[PDB]
Amino acid sequence: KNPKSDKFKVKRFHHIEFWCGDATNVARRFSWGLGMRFSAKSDLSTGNMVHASYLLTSGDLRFLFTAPYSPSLSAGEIKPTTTASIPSFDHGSCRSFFSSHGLGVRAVAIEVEDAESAFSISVANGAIPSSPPIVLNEAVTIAEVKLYGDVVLRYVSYKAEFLPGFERVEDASSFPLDYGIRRLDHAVGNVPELGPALTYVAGFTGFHQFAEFESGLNWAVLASNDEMVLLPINEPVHGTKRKSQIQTYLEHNEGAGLQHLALMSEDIFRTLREMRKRSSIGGFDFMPSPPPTYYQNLKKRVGDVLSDDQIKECEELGILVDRDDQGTLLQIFTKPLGDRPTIFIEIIQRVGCMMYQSGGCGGFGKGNFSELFKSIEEYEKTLE
Amino acid sequence: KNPKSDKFKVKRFHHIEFWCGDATNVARRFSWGLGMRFSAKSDLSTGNMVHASYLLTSGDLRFLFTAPYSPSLSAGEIKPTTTASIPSFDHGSCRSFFSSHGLGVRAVAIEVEDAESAFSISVANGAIPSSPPIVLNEAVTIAEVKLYGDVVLRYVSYKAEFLPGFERVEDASSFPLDYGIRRLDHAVGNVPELGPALTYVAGFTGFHQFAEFESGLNWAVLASNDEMVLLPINEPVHGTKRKSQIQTYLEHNEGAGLQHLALMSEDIFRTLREMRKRSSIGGFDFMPSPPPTYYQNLKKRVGDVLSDDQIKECEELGILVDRDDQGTLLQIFTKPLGDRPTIFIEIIQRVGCMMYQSGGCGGFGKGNFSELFKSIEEYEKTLE
Ligand SMILES: O=C(O)Cc1ccc(O)cc1
Ligand SMILES: O=C(O)Cc1ccc(O)cc1
Ligand SMILES: [Co+2]
Ligand SMILES: [Co+2]
User: Fold this and answer.
1) How many angstroms away from the CA of A277 is the closest CA of chain B?
2) Residues with C-beta less than 6 Å from any ligand 2 atom
C-alpha cells in the first residue's frame, strides 16, 4: 500500500550533517574508519569566520562535519554580512546541541525540487520551522524544519559544487579512500512516544507508512513516494526484564535524536573486511558477532539466495541476514561512534526487488530479533 | 648558570591532558596519526558516570583525552560520592574551556615526590590554586595550580596503573602502534606578556631560566633542577610587517594557552616517514618543507654531525636542523591539530650532551629563524 501522498517532490537523501566540537578530528577519524574521501571544505582558509565545515563523500553518500569557531572572530558580522557558508548555523544552537547531546547528527538533508515550496507546504501542514528558506549565490536554496528532538529535516534544491562558498579540497590532502560504501539507505530516530512523532512527520511530509514483513521497542518507517527516502522511528517498551536500548539512548542523549545511519555498500563483504582491519587503528568497532548457531540456521532460511561459501564469509565477518517476501537484507552494526551509547552506524546490502532496485528491499531486519534469540538459546544447548 | 632552585622535588613530565568534546574520536585520530597505543580507560564501562577519559602511550609519553558526559548521569552524586576518576574534573569548567578554546591542553602534569607538599609550597609562593590535593585510593596524590590562561600545572605523586579507577584496555582493542615517539621533551605556552608570566611561574616553582645560544616573538624557557622539565613561554612582538603568529594564536584561542608539545623520537626519520604516510588518511599534516637552499647550506653548519646521506633524508622529510655549542637539534612542526590555528605538535631528536643525555641539548631552534630567512632569500636568487 503506497498512496504516493508526498506533499512536495522529494528526490533523494542529500547529506547528513554532524555537529561537533572539533570537526577536523571527527572528519579525519570517519574518513579513515569508513573509507570516505575529503571532497569539500568551508573554513578560515575559504573566508568562513563562523564555522569549520568539512565534507566527506563515498559514492553518493555525503557526511558533513561542522564545528563553531570563537564567536569573537565574526563579532562584527550580521546575518546580511555573514561569512558562514551554511546560513542556518548558529554558535549558540551548536554549542547547546553538542553540550546536550555530544557528537551527533544535526541535519538529515533531502534534495527536493523546490526548497522554498517544500518549506512552505511543510509548515502549512504542521512542521515546526527551524530556518527559513535562504538562496545561496542564486544557485541553491536551503531550508530547515524540526524533525525530532534537536534534529532538523533539511531541504536542498538546485536551480541547475556541494554548496556555494565550499571549495573542493586540494589533491594532495584528498586521498581516494573507498571501502565500497555508496549511499545512505535510511536514517533512524529514537523518540519517547512513537505515535505523536509519526503523526507529526507524516503530517507535514505526506510520507506513508512502509509495509514491513517481544523485546525492546516498537517502530515504524516513513517513506517518500518512490520509497527512496526512508525514515524509521523507534520508541522504547518499558516493563521488560532487559532495559530497553531505546530508553538508554534517550537517557544518554538527553532526549530524542538520531539513533543510527544505515549506509548501503555495493560489496558488503569488502566493506566489512576493510572496516574491521581498521577497528583498532583508529576506525570503528563492531557489535559482537552472533553465535555459529545463527550461521548454521542460515542454510534453511537463505540457502536459496546465498551459497555455503558466501554464508561462511558472513560468519567470519559477523554479518546478519534477514529476508521478507521480496528481498534479502545483509546487515551489521557498529558500536557507538562516540563517547556516549547513542549514535551508531549500520552497513547494509540489499538483494532482490529489481525493476534498478526498489527501496527497502528486504525490510529493515525485523525478523532478526526472533532468529538471534533462537540462536543464543540453541548455542547454549549446543554448549551443554 | 643552573642555580638548582626548585622549591620542591620535581621528577619528570608525567602526562598531558586534552579537554575534548568527544574524547573517543580525538583519541582514535591521535593514536593512528602519532602511533600511540590505547593503554588505559576510565568511562561508563568502568563505572565513571562523569567523564570519558582515554589514555594513549608511546614510550614514556602519555596523552590523556577527556570529555564530559551529560551531567544528568551523575546528578545524584556529590564530590564525596563521585564516580569520576579525575576528582578535579568539572562539567562546567570543561564545557567552558572547550567552547572558549576549542580542542586544547588542559593539564601539563609533572610527577613530583609529594603532590601535597608541591601544592602547598607553590601556593605559598604565589601560585593560584586550581584543585587542592586529593589522595586516590591511598595510592596517588593529585593537585593543580594555574599555569597560564586556563592551563593548569598538575602535580602527581605516587606512594609506590595510570591512576586509580582507570582500567588497562582489552588486548584486541589495543593495537601496538609505535612510530618511535618516546617522551615529552617540552611544552610551550603563548601569553600576551612574557615578563609577568615568567615571574609568576618561576616565582612559585623555583624553576630557572634556561641558557639559550628580528621577527615574530620573544621567548624564554623555564627549567627544573636537572632541566628535564622544560617550559618555554612566548609573547608576541607587534609592529612587524608580518602579523605575529603568537598574536594570531591569542586571538583564535581566546587568550593565553599551550601552543605546542615537543615530542622526542628515538628515530626521527622513521617517525616522520610513518606520520607522513598517514597525513592524508586520518593522521597529521606537516608545515611546508624549507627550500633546498636550506639543505644546501646544511653542509657547512652540521656537516660534522650528519652525513650527506643523512642530510638528504632531512631534505625529503622536511626536517629542520639547528645547533648550539653543546648539541644538535633535529625538528619539524605539524600543522594545527584541530580546527583552530592554535595547538600544534613538534617532533624532535637531540644529538650530543651525553653524560644519559642532558636536557635541552641543542636548544630549541632559535637559530632557525635566521637560517630560514637566508634560505628563502637565496632560493629566490637561485630561482632568478
Ligand atoms: O531497525 C530499526 O528500525 C531501528 C533499530 C534497530 C535495532 C535496534 O537494536 C534498535 C533500533
Ligand atoms: O620554540 C619556541 O620557543 C616556541 C615557538 C617556536 C616556533 C614558533 O613559530 C613560535 C613559537
Ligand atoms: Co536499520
Ligand atoms: Co619547540
Assistant:
1) 11
2) B 188, 217, 219, 232, 234, 245, 259, 364-365
